[PDB]
Amino acid sequence: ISPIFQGGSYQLNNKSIDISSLLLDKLSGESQTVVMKFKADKPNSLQALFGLSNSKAGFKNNYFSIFMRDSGEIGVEIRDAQKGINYLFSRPASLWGKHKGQAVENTLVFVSDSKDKTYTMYVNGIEVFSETVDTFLPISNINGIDKATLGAVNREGKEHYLAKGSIDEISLFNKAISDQEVSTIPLSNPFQLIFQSGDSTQANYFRIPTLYTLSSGRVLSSIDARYGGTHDSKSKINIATSYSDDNGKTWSEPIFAMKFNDYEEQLVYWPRDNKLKNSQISGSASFIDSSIVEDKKSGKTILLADVMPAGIGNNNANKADSGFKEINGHYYLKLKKNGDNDFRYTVRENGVVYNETTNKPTNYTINDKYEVLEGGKSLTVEQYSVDFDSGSLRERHNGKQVPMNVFYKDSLFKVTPTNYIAMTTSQNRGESWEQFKLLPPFLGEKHNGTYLCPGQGLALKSSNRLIFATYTSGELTYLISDDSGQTWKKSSASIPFKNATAEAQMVELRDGVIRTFFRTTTGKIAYMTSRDSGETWSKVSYIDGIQQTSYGTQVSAIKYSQLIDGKEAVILSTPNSRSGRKGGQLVVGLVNKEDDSIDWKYHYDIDLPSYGYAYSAITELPNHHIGVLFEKYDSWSRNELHLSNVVQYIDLEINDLT
Ligand SMILES: O=S(=O)(O)CCNCc1ccccc1
Prior knowledge:
This protein is mainly beta. 2% of the residues lie in helices and 43% in strands.
């Protein structure tokens, strides 16, 4: 249907615009849709874009508004004091402010549906909330509405929630338009989605993006496909990948690089209320924090990620146990059988389950998928699904049998409840992945494994050496392979932090010279340098000119192929804020060839200093543009958990940065 009202080119300069005479007598029936294209690159702390109100004395709580915050949050209020209704629906991190130094036109669609008693908000093609209520309040059925306002809400004759911005287009319809119709509305987005709710992963949430440019020109991305909200492990999380063959313009439907089947792959709307938001899937195995490298020699793509057995995360992982037993020079995965109090088994060569107590082999084997076989026959367990039907999180058997895996809760043989690192490879540049293999322990029998640094591994340009940074208490532990990832050794580098989440990413400044940038607990990004391809490492220094919070955020980094201002360039991606995960920047550093010091010369603001920016991935695309895949929200904040479609991709050119 056509709109009942359509207007545009409204400048909101801290002074509301009255459109009552144009709009109010057009509103009819109980269902409405608002479509608004607007910019706000300098918003006030809290501002209303659109209002319908009773402006009379004594009715200050009788209004409908669409409002936004300078955090990027969008919402509505629907209030009628006589009816005793005060609805407030919102979602943080729903907006864009600026892109390449120009105000972004956001496309907002709000649907108020009296038949289904549902209010739904979309911004930039993304559904940010949908709420059904028992008692529906039609937005123009508020008692005594007499004002329709842009850029404020008129309460008792005065302008509340004054806005700074512009409304380039606004249309209203006397209908609740369908989800289908909504998808036909043209967008002006500065970003793309690679992974998204409803795609092949069936995860409603994503965190921990990676990007890596392959020698063929294909660009590969990996990510945590997070099912149980945005919570870290313990949860259900798989590792998913997608690639682009056209410099990031289009992306393939995701596949899994690493997945477990003990719990169903469910798209769930995780509760965001204060009573339930900490609900966490507690009996599932998971993968978390992936990293990618390409090996020139074999041509293989290699992906590592952490592996968590059922119910395990970084807080409950046994720090005093590697999960392997050393038996005369070699490491074997330990197992515990149903009914035993101790781990009396190991997995030996060709997956043979061996009884340590009587030194006898059993009739059980572990296959390449870490599944349990008895006499060559596959054992199974019943799968779990999760629901909130009862008003709290329930995890329950769903009738489906899946192969019995030693990382599962229901398995006959169970691994040590600690954290592991696994590796998988692809021979077809991400079209398919092999079954993963566990890496051996590097810090001994009675030390839990290190944690992989998400993002990229490093393929040294002048050799066959591959390095993945990892972290643990008191050091970075670099994992080094010179044989296409068949065998690994560690190189340890002490850091002056205990229990830091020291997520580290590397750039090769010149042949054999590696600088590693890493997250600390000091509010400053740190770095160290190797001049012998990772064998030995310098002391730790800090970057001035960038701020992080006390808890820190992952930082991504690449060595740009082209000179900038006649110099070798490194590009860092990080939030720049001492307050939260916001104020995203790309920072271009120029290398001084005399001492390898870096002059951090240009800071490019990804979006507003107040808008969210957390973990990130950056890569030089084959056409020398820069691709950035990043968490566009505060992934630390307890107010911004469980948001969909906030991991987003943008394309930048060096000219945009400098
Ligand atoms: O809290 S955050 O800084 O956003 C993310 C930190 N994830 C650490 C982790 C790594 C591996 C397993 C569990 C937890």
